[PDB]
């Protein structure tokens, strides 16, 4: 008798949070088939980094962690390690020694609405970029230059977050894509999530 | 602590005008979409239209049987939103409210309204 | 202009009993959907959103299903504070939301 990770929790649900408040989940004390995800073929973008899905399904790690999100599809290239732009900067920020894989699907069908879907958002404006899995969720005034803001928005005063609008009618580079990314960390402690082939 | 209040409205003979008002206060008008449903007596909830915030552009969009007779704006200046009505019929005659959405965190749900207010009565005959 | 209908019309249960309530689109509304109790003079209250999921403080005898075309709300154990309309509404149309007629729910006593 195996205990399974609750994946389809994770992949499969109503709603994805939006990049810059992005969404983790702890992964423990399971069994998990990776090739079933590799081989799935719904995946547009399968990338793992510091392993390989061959033998994802033969290693163990003591700690695994499901970071999902939406983006645009012309931005899931910036999810890998030592990139830059408006996700990688501001939003989600991935480490340049990472280990794990990144997986994003299509989701125009799921997250668009006719006349612009303004639930899911990104952060347009910051001062500094973010340091690797760093959560930003603030809405202050940003200011640009050197006039104060007092807090309202103005000439040289911003709001820090802007919605997608996804439209089912939007080019395919534009379209709601859901990202989910899959963490391994691995410590001098006893392993919990391990493939079916240990 | 988020609250909305109604103000104006009343008896006004056909063809004729009124402007709603509507008070925010508990949460930054600014950061929220704010709409207008109404409900005739005893004939279920109609959605009037709505005014998005800012930061997305502002822009409104109403519904087809009101359409270019009501107009909404807002004031975020006094945290007030404005429905203009027009070319009243007694078909319009019915309790109007103001309402905002479920995006006040992290998790965004535009159009689920989870606050209303009290909503003023509109009565439209001869 | 999607448009939503919902059934029953009315209905009256005794209290402690299941009741649910349907709700159809004329087209997918995808999982845009919400449900919105009425009580008698008052405001409408809003109970489910995105088609499963419960608004704080609403009773978890509330509960929401659906997906496409249809939906369901139910009502584990109903009580007299329920009696009120019940309404679905949809928001994948941006530009254009539409509710339904409603639906009365009544006791049995």
């Known amino acids: 008798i195996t205990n399974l990770c609750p994946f389809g929790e994770v992949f499969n649900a109503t709603r994805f949070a939006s990049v810059y408040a992005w969404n983790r989940k702890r992964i423990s004390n399971c069994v998990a088939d990776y090739s079933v995800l590799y081989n799935s073929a719904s995946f547009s973008t399968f990338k793992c980094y510091g392993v390989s899905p061959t033998k994802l399904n033969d290693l163990c790690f003591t700690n695994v962690y499901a970071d999902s999100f939406v983006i645009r599809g012309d931005e899931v290239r910036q999810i890998a390690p030592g990139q830059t732009g408006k996700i990688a900067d501001y939003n989600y920020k991935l480490p340049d020694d990472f280990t794990g894989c990144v997986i994003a699907w299509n989701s125009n069908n799921l997250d668009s609405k006719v006349g612009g879907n303004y639930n899911y958002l990104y952060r347009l404006f910051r001062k500094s970029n973010l340091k690797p899995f760093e959560r930003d969720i603030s809405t202050e005034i940003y200011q640009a230059g050197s006039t104060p803001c007092n807090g309202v928005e103005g000439f040289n005063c911003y709001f820090p977050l802007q919605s997608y609008g996804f439209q089912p009618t939007n080019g395919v580079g534009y379209q709601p894509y859901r990202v989910v990314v899959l963490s391994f960390e691995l410590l001098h402690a006893p392993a919990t999530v391990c493939g079916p082939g240990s | 602590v988020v609250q909305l209040v109604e103000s104006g409205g009343g008896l006004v003979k056909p063809g004729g005008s009124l402007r709603l008002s509507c008070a925010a206060s508990?949460?930054?008008?600014?950061?929220?979409?704010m709409s207008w449903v109404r409900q005739a007596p005893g004939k279920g909830l109609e959605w009037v239209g709505r005014?998005?915030?800012?930061?997305?552009?502002?822009?409104?969009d109403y519904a087809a049987p009101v359409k270019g007779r009501f107009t909404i704006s807002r004031d975020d200046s006094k945290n007030t939103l404005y429905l203009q009505m027009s070319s009243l019929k007694t078909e319009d005659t019915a309790v109007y409210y103001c309402?905002?959405?479920?995006?006040?965190?992290?998790?965004?749900?535009?159009?689920?309204?989870?606050?209303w207010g009290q909503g003023t009565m509109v009565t439209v005959s001869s | 202009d999607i448009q939503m209908t919902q059934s029953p019309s009315s209905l009256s249960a005794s209290v402690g009993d299941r009741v649910t309530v349907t709700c159809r689109a004329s087209?997918?509304?995808?999982?845009?959907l919400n449900w919105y109790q009425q009580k008698p003079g008052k405001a409408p209250k809003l109970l489910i959103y995105?088609?499963?999921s419960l608004q704080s403080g609403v009773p978890s005898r509330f509960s929401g299903s659906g997906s496409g075309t249809d939906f369901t709300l139910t009502i584990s154990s109903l009580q007299p504070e329920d009696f009120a309309t019940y309404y679905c509404?949809?928001?994948?149309?941006?530009?254009?939301?539409?509710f339904g007629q409603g639906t009365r729910v009544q006791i049995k006593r």
């Open positions: 309402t905002t959405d479920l995006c006040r965190s992290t998790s965004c749900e535009h159009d689920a309204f989870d606050i």
């Open positions: 508990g949460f930054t008008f600014s950061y929220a979409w």
């Open positions: 005014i998005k915030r800012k930061s997305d552009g502002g822009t409104t």
């Open positions: 087209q997918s509304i995808r999982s845009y």
């Open positions: 995105a088609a499963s």
């Open positions: 509404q949809q928001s994948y149309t941006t530009p254009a939301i539409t």
